[PDB]
Every structure is written in C-alpha cells, then in structure tokens.
Amino acid sequence: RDNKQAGVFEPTIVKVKSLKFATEAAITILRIDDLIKLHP
Amino acid sequence: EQYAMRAFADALEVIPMALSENSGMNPIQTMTEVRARQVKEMNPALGID
Amino acid sequence: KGAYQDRDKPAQIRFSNISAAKAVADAIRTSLGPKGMDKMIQDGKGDVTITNDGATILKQMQVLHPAARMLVELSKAQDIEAGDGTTSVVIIAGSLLDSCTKLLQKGIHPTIISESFQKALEKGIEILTDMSRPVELSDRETLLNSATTSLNSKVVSQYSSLLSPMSVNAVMKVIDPATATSVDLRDIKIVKKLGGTIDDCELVEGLVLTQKVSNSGITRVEKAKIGLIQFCLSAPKTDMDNQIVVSDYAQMDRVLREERAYILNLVKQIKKTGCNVLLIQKSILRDALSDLALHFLNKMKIMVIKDIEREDIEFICKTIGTKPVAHIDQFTADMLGSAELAEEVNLNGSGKLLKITGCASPGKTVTIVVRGSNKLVIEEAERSIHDALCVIRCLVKKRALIAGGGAPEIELALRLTEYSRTLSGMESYCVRAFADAMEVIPSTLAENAGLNPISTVTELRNRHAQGEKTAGINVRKGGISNILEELVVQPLLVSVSALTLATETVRSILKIDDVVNT
Amino acid sequence: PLSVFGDRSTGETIRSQNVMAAASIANIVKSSLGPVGLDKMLVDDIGDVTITNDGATILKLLEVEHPAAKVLCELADLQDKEVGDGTTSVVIIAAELLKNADELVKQKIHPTSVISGYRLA
Ligand SMILES: Nc1ncnc2c1ncn2[C@@H]1O[C@H](COP(=O)(O)OP(=O)(O)O)[C@@H](O)[C@H]1O
Ligand SMILES: Nc1ncnc2c1ncn2[C@@H]1O[C@H](COP(=O)(O)OP(=O)(O)O)[C@@H](O)[C@H]1O
Ligand SMILES: [Mg+2]
Ligand SMILES: [Mg+2]
C-alpha cells in the first residue's frame, strides 16, 4: 500500500545512521582473520 | 614441478652427509668434493671414505 | 678426524630457538600487505583489540619462548626507529633463522654464519641505497603516495583519501620543511572520542580539551583572551600550618566579609586585564575553584575551564601562545594568550568537546580528532594514523625513497645471490641462504592476495634479472607490474632499519648456546 | 609450535563463530520488530523484572561474553544515543549483511573486496 496514504513516515536520519553504523560495524568485525583468547 | 625433483635429490643426497658427519669429517665440503669427483671422472663408485 | 663436540645441548637449544622464531614469524605472516587481515587479541581480562600492527600484536600476545620475546623486542625497536615495517622485520628475522637452521645441519659453525650474514647485510644496505631515488619536501604528491601506501594495509584504507592528506598536513604544519633533520610526535595530540563514523575525523590547528565548562551559562566566546592559572582561587592558606581563632561574635562577620573581599579582589584583578576565558590548573591540597569564586567569575561574564593536567601546560602554551601565572601580581594582558574563537560543542550526545580555534599567536602544533562507531575501529584508526605519521617522520629523517610491493627485497635477493656466487668458501652458502631468505616477503604478499606464490616469485625474479627494477606485485591488476606508475612507494629508512635490526638480532640469537632457569 | 598459553582459532572457524554470535544476537532482537512484534520480558537474578521492546534496552540488559556480539550491542547503544529510533533495525541489518559477506567469503572471495563493495554500496 502507498505509505503516503496511511502516513507511515520516519525521519531520514534513522535510516541513514542505521545503514552507516551497521555497515561500519560489519566491516570492523569482518576484518577478523583469527582470534587469540588469552587464559586469565 | 622441478622444485619437488630437486628436493628429492637433496633429500636422498643427505645420506652421504650423515655418513660423513658420523665419520667425524666436515659433511658439506667432503660431500661437495666427492660429488665433483663423480661428475668430473665418470666413476660413479666414489663414496664417503 | 676432528673435534668430537660431545655436548649436544647447544645444538638442541639453537634448533629450539630457530623453531620458536619461525613459528612466531608464521603466526603473523598472514597479516602482511594490503590483503593481510588483522588479528584479534583478548587478554586475561575481558578486553579485546583488533590489531594489524605487528608490534601491538606481539606485545598483547603474551609469548613464553625467549626467541619470541627477543623478536617482540625487535619489533618494538623497529617501531621506535621507523614506525612502519614492524611486521616485515619480524618476518625477515624468522625466515632467515629458518634458512640458517639447515646451515647448522650442514656442519657450519655459528660464528661463520653470523659473520657471513653481517657481510650480506653490508652488501644489501649498499644495494638498497643504489636502488633508491632522492626525495625532497614540498612535493605533496609523493608524500600523499607514501601516506596512502602506509595506510593501505589497515582497516582505514577506504578512508585514506580523506585521512592521508590530513595525516601529512599534520606533520607539515608542525616542522619547518627547510631545516628539520627530525620531527616530534609528542606535539601531535591524537584525541579519540566514541561516536560518529571515520569520515568525521578532523584536523584542528587550535587546541582540544576534554574538560567541561564549570559555569553552564556561557558556551561560546568570540575574540577570546585565554589565561592559564597555576595558583588557586579559594580562601587564602599558607604553606605552613594555617589557623584562625575567633573569640567574639563580630569576628565571624569579619572573617566572612574578609574572605569574600579577598576572593572578589582576586576575581577583579583577573577581570581587569580583559581576560574573558580562564583556564585553572588541576590543583590538589587547595580547592582550585570556590563556589563563591565561580559565582563571581560568572557574574563578570567569563568562561572558566578547571581541572587541567599539569603535564598539559606545555602543550597548551605551545598551542595558544599563553604564559602560565603562579602569582596574581604577574597576571597582565601583555602575556595573555589570544584566540579568534572558543567553542564548546556537543558531539551529537556522545560527548562534550572544547575547541580553541583561530589563535592569533602562531601555533607549532595541530590536533587530530578521530571518530568511529565502536571503540575498536577508533583504536585501530589512531594506530594507523600514527603509522602514517611515523612514515612521514622517516621521510623527514633521511631523504631517500624506494619502491614497494616486494620489489626492493626481491631485487636485493637477486643482487645478493649474484654476490654470493663470487664468494667461494664456507661463506658462499651462508650468503646464498641470506639472499634466498629475503624472498619470503614477496612470497607472503603473493599468497596473502590469493596469487600463486611460486609463479609470482619466479616471474618477479625474471623481471628483476633483466634490470626492470622497481617491478613488483600489484593486487589491483592481480599480477606483476611496475610499481612506481602504480603510486606505491616507501621511505628507504624503513627497509634499511628493518634489514639491519633483523640481522643484528639474528646474530645475537645465533650467539646463544644455552638456557638456564634462574 | 607457538608458546602463548592461550587458545588460538584461525581461518574459517573464527569467521563462522563470529557470524554465529552476530546471528544469535539478531535472533534475540528480531522477534520484537514491527507493529506486530511482541515485546520481551527480562527478569534479573534477584527478580527485578522489566518488560521492553526497544533493542537498545534488551541488549544492554543482556549479559554478553563473545566480543563479536559485544560489538553489535555497542552498535545498538550508539544508534540509541545518536538517533533514538531504529535500534533493532541496525542490529538486524548488520547481522544479516555480515552473514551474507561470510557466505561470499566461503567461496574464496577475498574479504577486502567484500569490504570495499559494502563501503561503496
Ligand atoms: N597497494 C599495495 N600494493 C602492493 N604492495 C603493497 C601495497 N601497500 C603495501 N604494500 C606492501 O605491503 C608490505 C607491508 O606493509 P604494511 O602492512 O603497510 O606495514 P608493515 O610493513 O609494518 O607490515 C610493504 O612492504 C609494502 O611493500
Ligand atoms: N503502521 C505501520 N505500517 C507499516 N509499517 C510500519 C508501521 N509502523 C511501523 N512500521 C514498520 O515497522 C518497523 C518497526 O520498527 P521498530 O521496532 O518500532 O523500531 P525500533 O527498532 O527503534 O524499535 C519500522 O521499520 C517501520 O517501518
Ligand atoms: Mg606499513
Ligand atoms: Mg521503533
């Protein structure tokens, strides 16, 4: 349905910030090639 | 595929090296000299003294 | 015929050291070049880090073998001397130790190997010097090329277009490019705050404070007159024991009125000099700001910044050109710092940051603020910026620039093999092993990129044999090409320091023959 | 080999582990998305119970040990601070595209290329 008819709108800030933050977090977590868990 | 062939050559040629080292002589120089003797005069019956 | 050398423990110890060094080198082998992916280290406490710098990876990883510890010290020394190549030096050291293990197995005394390695290093330094080309400042293009090359193997590579120009501008705005002979990184303050994305990093010619404004009535100041304070704006108290005795009812009124008048006198002397923003040093044993004092300062329409660290006074003075005062009688406008603007900015709910910008007095200092979504990318971004700054410092130190992408060490391998072929004796094998143990870097660059290591290294050797120097691995093309036309260069000091440090530490390792627990 | 006195996970193992952690967090937060999403109940050790729908509160209240999921939790907290709305959306998007990227990597595609592709996208 046409959301304009029902009025479902969200500020573009939510979408832009969510996309940028999600892709950057994925980039940071994806650079991992191996993990070294040190014993306490 | 020549890398594997040369590795095989060196690996089988370590046996004179171990023989000379057990004999007390310097392995690398003696082995090189006897190999040079074998290739100069076609006498393939030259081994570690 | 010969010495029996009944003791075999020295041989076992030497082979153990070589094996440990080779294992440590192989551990970080896959973290080299643009296609190398960074490691993740979590120490005993639940703190994690995403590190690609070899020095950090080796320091955080708590090793246990003596050879590994000597290697991590080598890596940190190379970082101190150059700042880039802290992975390649460790790789070179481990690789040529693994090369010399078979020299030990061939019946060669360790001293002969050490001396021959020294001779090979002596030849290699000259080879690297010949291979280089002169580099001179004010050529922003080659500086940007070197910065981008330094940043390519880091997570911030995609931001390098918006992060390398400011990285080199930071250095160019601190030191004179005419007569420098060195630069300092202490006066490059890297301030990190969580929030935002990397594309929000900024370079400010002014001063950045993480402190907070005490009087929440004044936020911005135009034409600011900044003045540091080193004494305390509170009730007077002598160094030795202080005591006041009251014996009458009028004495309470007298002491209250006199304390108020003293504070008001101090604030009036501060204000009459035209000072409009005040900076109070973080003082202990005496309240730096009193509530009455802060009230008076706010009444006279001033901005107050308190709790400033002692070690930051030098930085602030070098930035905004002010001079500290430790006595009110010497507080004059003739030695009062000035700036165009002072602002307090809220960082989209992530923090509160103070900027002193447009300082009329000259400032030989810049400040970089780095932004990121989570803390790990912020740490890695500041480390990468530090690496680029160290690369520019290397360029300033000695002016010599060489190619990269495997070309320098593969050309060195060819030249040193040809030099070893004219060194008949027991050192010919050692120089040959040194020459062929420096092909580990091009092989690692090839295999980390998914290329075929054997064919890539062979074609590189063929290309450099024909004299087609400065030809190396290209990951955009996915093959071998001229690197200078691809804009990948590095200062010569990094390579020379790596080679020399690796050779010296390997000679030291070879001199070992026993380990005993104390 | 290495003398580190710890645990080492290299290659496909750690990549799959990170993807699984991200997917676990996304699956915890996913059922509370949309007008038809029904909110969750979070009860503490001592009985302090709360009823909530926003992703930021759910992730903050949860105790997470795997750092690959701590990253997503901090991402949700950051999205809450900078914007306020869309906290579940960012976690869902991040975990899903991480899963897709790992699927790409399993076919021997270099992760630098997929990172550059995501950044341009
Ligand atoms: N774009 C590129 N193309 C080819 N090789 C590169 C490129 N960028 C860097 N390299 C090579 O990768 C090697 C490792 O550099 P880097 O990982 O940035 O720092 P370190 O030398 O401390 O590991 C360098 O010797 C350099 O020659
Ligand atoms: N009346 C509606 N009609 C259609 N879609 C809606 C309606 N209300 C909400 N949505 C969608 O459902 C999603 C609900 O997101 P929500 O979980 O409330 O955000 P948050 O993660 O901040 O809690 C939104 O992405 C929105 O696009
Ligand atoms: Mg580098
Ligand atoms: Mg919502």
Side-chain angles (χ1 to χ4, degrees), chain C residues 27 35 37 39-40 42 48 61-64 158-159 195 199 348-350 374 376 448, chain D residues 1-5 8 15 67 71 74-75 78 81-82 110-113 115-116 119:
Chain C
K35 296 304 188 187
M37 302 311 248
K39 200 162 298 279
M40 183 177 177
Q42 161 159 8
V48 311
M61 182 179 72
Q62 269 151 344
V63 296
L64 294 174
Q158 290 282 263
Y159 318 111
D199 275 328
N348 322 114
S350 315
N374 53 7
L376 322 176
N448 264 359
Chain D
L2 269 177
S3 315
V4 183
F5 184 46
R8 183 186 172 93
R15 281 212 197 280
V71 166
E74 301 186 276
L75 182 65
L78 168 84
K81 295 216 319 297
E82 316 273 339
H110 203 273
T112 48
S113 293
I115 276 161
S116 188
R119 187 267 183 276

Side-chain angles (χ1 to χ4, degrees), chain C residues 28 31-36 52-55 78 83-89 91 148-154 387 391 403-409 441 445 472-476 483 486-490 494-495 498:
Chain C
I28 77 170
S31 305
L32 179 78
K35 296 304 188 187
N52 201 6
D53 214 33
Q78 159 70 5
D84 203 355
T86 185
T87 299
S88 67
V89 55
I91 288 179
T148 301
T149 300
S150 56
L151 292 170
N152 264 347
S153 87
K154 299 294 155 48
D387 270 9
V391 161
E409 55 268 13
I441 302 298
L445 268 71
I473 310 187
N474 199 10
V475 307
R476 162 172 65 78
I483 301 299
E486 201 264 330
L487 308 162
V488 161
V489 294
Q490 58 176 353
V494 164
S495 301

Side-chain angles (χ1 to χ4, degrees), chain C residues 216-242:
Chain C
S216 55
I218 305 101
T219 300
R220 288 178 76 262
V221 167
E222 285 265 14
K223 307 203 145 305
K225 294 322 200 79
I226 306 95
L228 294 174
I229 294 288
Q230 305 209 270
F231 64 102
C232 310
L233 286 185
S234 68
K237 167 180 54 182
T238 63
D239 289 330
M240 52 167 200
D241 297 338
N242 188 45

